[PDB]
Amino acid sequence: PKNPDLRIAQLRFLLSLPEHRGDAAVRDELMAAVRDNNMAPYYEALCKSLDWQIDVDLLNKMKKANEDELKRLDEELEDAEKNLGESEIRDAMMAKAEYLCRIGDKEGALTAFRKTYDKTVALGHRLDIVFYLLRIGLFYMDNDLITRNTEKAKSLIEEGGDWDRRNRLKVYQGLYCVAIRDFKQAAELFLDTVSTFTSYELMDYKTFVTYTVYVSMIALERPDLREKVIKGAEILEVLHSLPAVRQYLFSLYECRYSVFFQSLAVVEQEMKKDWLFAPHYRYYVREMRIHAYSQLLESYRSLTLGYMAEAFGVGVEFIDQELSRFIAAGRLHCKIDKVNEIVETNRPDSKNWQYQETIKKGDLLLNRVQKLSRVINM
């Protein structure tokens, strides 16, 4: 079907780019591909994985027989029985369309989708078709499919039916995680976590908890992080199951930095086995290290980095080279020092922060009225 279907797109990625990760993924994918009569979309995978094997002709006559069994079903149906809409012609012809996502490629499935969308009036059945486009566009990460049908979902459909949209509240920001919006939108609408039935519309629950807790500690640090993920109750049930994730949380909040990096290196290595993975590990770790440095350099204005030699980890020169890259990066607002070996900080004040903002917003509007005064008057 399409309900556990996104595990396949994980094993497409996990087998492909790490060739060293190629032992057990091929063992339970090819047997899963000869299951469910999966015939069209694996020829690309059959080029990148092992060479060839003859069960193609055996499943081609199986995929043609099930095609012809439903072909003679709905041609006799459309030629004898003449009630339409969401009728028997509808669910037989979507069973062709469900067949071409389950077995076929996208092309026969999408033209059956755009045909059957133009026939119906019940917007729940319309939104279920848009649920099917959004999932096959999430398989092949087609960025042009998803910009269309999300606008179909918001504008063209959801002025009516209700509490079916919370399935898409998990999807609109699941697409924001595969983009670079790992910062605020994904953490904002993963915050409603009460949808637990591991469905097709709720693809998994325990990994969804790990996803909403990784993205959460970048949106907000001290701006009451603790109410929504620490004082939050139903989030705290399932991270009481997972021991490493709760250890990864409370190392950051209760300020134990040495055990925090041991957790963080496990997270980055566990991050590697993801399929929306492109914008993660490289950008995630570098943001979380400067995240922990900002609160540690806070509450101090004169820190010696020999105090960071053992209350932090080890490696005197390692802190020295990483602060030097971060201060030169335009971030991590302090000043590192040699001999004296005392990391000195500096911050703006009331006057200094309010003048730095008004010097920029003033010049932007001043340049804006340079052009506006010259568009008029010739």
Binding site: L323, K335, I336, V339, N340
Partner: protein
């Protein structure tokens, strides 16, 4: 002829009507403001000038057979408009010949009889009071005369027909333009002629004869008074001397004519491009990169035009001559793909301490540097190859020993690293100081009186600029 000859009637049909009513409304409305309300800057003078750059160059290049632009030369071959009967009879000639050319085929000039069809427009009782009509409707057929692009024996017809116009242009100047002041049109007329007259003197010998004319042309401009005249002729005079690869820049350093004072958002943006290149070649990098920044952010209103990619081209070099670099290829184009790869990979090698890659990609992409006219980077950016790190270190560290900066700049010598730090503070790269007693190089002090003493020295300009907006608003308010 059954395929394309049957698609020959649609071409003429329209453009014989709405492209004809363009200059009919332009020539009527320019005459209407030349007569009354003699301050005629606010008309379709500007939009037709934006059209003669954009529209009528690509509305027609050839004279558009079956008599759309082919008819324009026998249409305007008979123009007196002299007295009130000579206007009303030519108004009948505006009725009859446009009916004939809309119906049948009139006198088709075969691309070389265009100049005798520019004689009887100048002849046939043509007027001097209708000096916008003579100036516009002679220069506007010169663009089909130049953008035919055949460039053989029409180049001397280019040379003749411009000096036909420029003899009328100079005589109008020595003709006392009463209350019209065609200079508002004749500036870009003097530009559009001399863009391709510069091309003609690139296809033949040098254009210093243009500059000897343009010096006298800049002399009679602004001695009368400036109405965009000093602005246009100065960028024209500056461009050849910058185009010549001779010495040519201390001529521009002593060019004390630095007040166009208004440029309608278009001359001033490219004027700041030229003088930014000039202040870059005499090694003043700070003032250059900020007026190159001002030129880039002033008039970008195009669609992947290229000179915007050229001011973006020179701006990254002088910032690599002072260390910082932003994201450059975030506005990538089908043509910027050619021109992003050398410069993005150039600053890739500059930020790292690799010089073998820096010399390799000089050898790899030097011929692209030949097309951009920027040979000089190899002799003057190898300075900042060692100076980028010492700018980066002295911004990061606060009180460093010179014994440790030797390995950090991988120089393997503390004794000359004093001198590199001495040269950078001599050049004002970093404001820091050196303790020559036990080897300390400490940075500056804390954030200074910036919260107290400075900000009124930014506030004074913003008062003065915004009330001048209020002043320029109120003065130009009421035309009725």
């Amino acid at each position: 002829p059954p395929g394309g000859g049957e698609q020959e009637p649609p071409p003429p049909p329209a453009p014989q009507d709405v492209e004809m009513k363009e200059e009919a409304a332009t020539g009527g409305g320019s005459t209407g403001e030349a007569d009354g309300k003699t301050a005629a800057a606010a008309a379709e003078h500007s939009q037709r000038e934006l059209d003669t750059v954009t529209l009528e160059d690509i509305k027609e290049h050839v004279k558009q057979l079956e008599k759309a632009v082919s008819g324009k030369e026998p249409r305007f071959v008979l123009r007196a408009l002299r007295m009130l009967p000579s206007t009303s009879r030519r108004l009948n000639h505006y009725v009859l010949y446009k009916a004939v050319q809309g119906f049948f085929t009139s006198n088709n000039a075969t691309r070389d009889f265009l100049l005798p069809f520019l004689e009887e427009p100048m002849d046939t009782e043509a007027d001097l009071q209708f000096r916008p009509r003579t100036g516009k409707a002679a220069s506007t057929p010169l663009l089909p005369e130049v953008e035919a692009y055949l460039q053989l024996l029409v180049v001397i017809f280019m040379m003749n027909s411009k000096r036909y116009k420029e003899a009328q242009k100079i005589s109008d100047d020595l003709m006392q333009k009463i209350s019209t002041q065609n200079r508002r049109a004749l500036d870009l007329v003097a530009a559009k002629c001399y863009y391709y007259h510069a091309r003609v003197y690139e296809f033949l010998d040098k254009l210093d004869v243009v500059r000897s004319f343009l010096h006298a042309r800049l002399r009679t401009a602004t001695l009368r008074h400036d109405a965009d005249g000093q602005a246009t002729l100065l960028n024209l005079l500056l461009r050849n001397y910058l185009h010549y690869s001779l010495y040519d820049q201390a001529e521009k350093l002593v060019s004390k004519s630095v007040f166009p004072e208004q440029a309608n958002n278009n001359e001033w943006a490219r004027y700041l491009y030229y003088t930014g290149r000039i202040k870059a070649i005499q090694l003043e990098y700070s003032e250059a990169r900020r007026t190159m920044t001002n030129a880039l952010r002033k008039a970008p209103q195009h669609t992947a035009v290229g000179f915007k990619q050229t001011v973006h081209k020179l701006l990254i070099v002088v910032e690599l001559l002072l260390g910082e670099i932003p994201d450059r290829l975030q506005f990538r184009q089908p043509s910027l793909k050619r021109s992003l790869m050398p410069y993005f990979l150039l600053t890739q090698a500059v930020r790292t301490g690799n010089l073998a890659k820096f010399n390799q990609v000089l050898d790899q992409f030097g011929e692209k540097f030949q097309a951009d006219g920027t040979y000089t980077l190899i002799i003057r950016l190898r300075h900042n190859v060692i100076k980028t790190g010492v700018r980066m270190i002295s911004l990061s560290y606060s009180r460093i020993s010179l014994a440790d900066i030797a390995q950090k700049l991988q120089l393997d010598s503390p004794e000359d690293a004093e001198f590199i730090v001495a040269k950078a503070i001599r050049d004002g790269v970093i404001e820091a100081s050196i303790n020559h007693e036990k080897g300390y190089v400490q940075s500056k002090e804390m954030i200074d009186i910036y919260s107290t003493r400075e900000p009124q020295l930014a506030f004074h300009q913003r008062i003065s600029f915004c009330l001048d907006i209020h002043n320029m608003s109120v003065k130009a308010m009421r035309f009725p």
